[PDB]
């Protein structure tokens, strides 16, 4: 079940990669018996850095950015939301 985690931006960012769909909407899908519109997932986690230290794992799905639910959101829409924050990032991530 999803966990809420805080990543503190270092000089070189949050140290993880997001990958997902380019266009809005998409098929409803179930993770751990729970239904969602398509989510972006963490495609890479920089070892020993920021996101890693925060507990984010590769293949984690991103459910919320800073408390904003982002299911069904496009890739551009999500990465924008992350980069909005000055100092830090609060992620609601979901493992599989």
């Amino acid at each position: 079940s999803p966990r809420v985690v805080r990543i503190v931006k270092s000089e070189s960012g949050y140290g993880f990669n997001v990958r997902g769909q380019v266009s809005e909407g998409g098929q409803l899908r179930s993770i751990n018996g729970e239904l969602y519109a398509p989510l972006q997932h963490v495609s890479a986690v920089l070892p020993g850095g920021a996101a890693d230290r925060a507990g984010v794992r590769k293949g984690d799905r991103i459910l919320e950015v800073n408390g904003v639910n982002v299911e069904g959101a496009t890739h551009k829409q999500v990465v924008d939301l992350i980069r909005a924050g000055e100092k830090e990032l609060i992620l609601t991530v979901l493992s599989v």
Partner: peptide, 6 residues
């Protein structure tokens, strides 16, 4: 379909 480094 697309990736970003953040």
């Amino acid at each position: 379909e697309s990736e970003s480094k953040v």
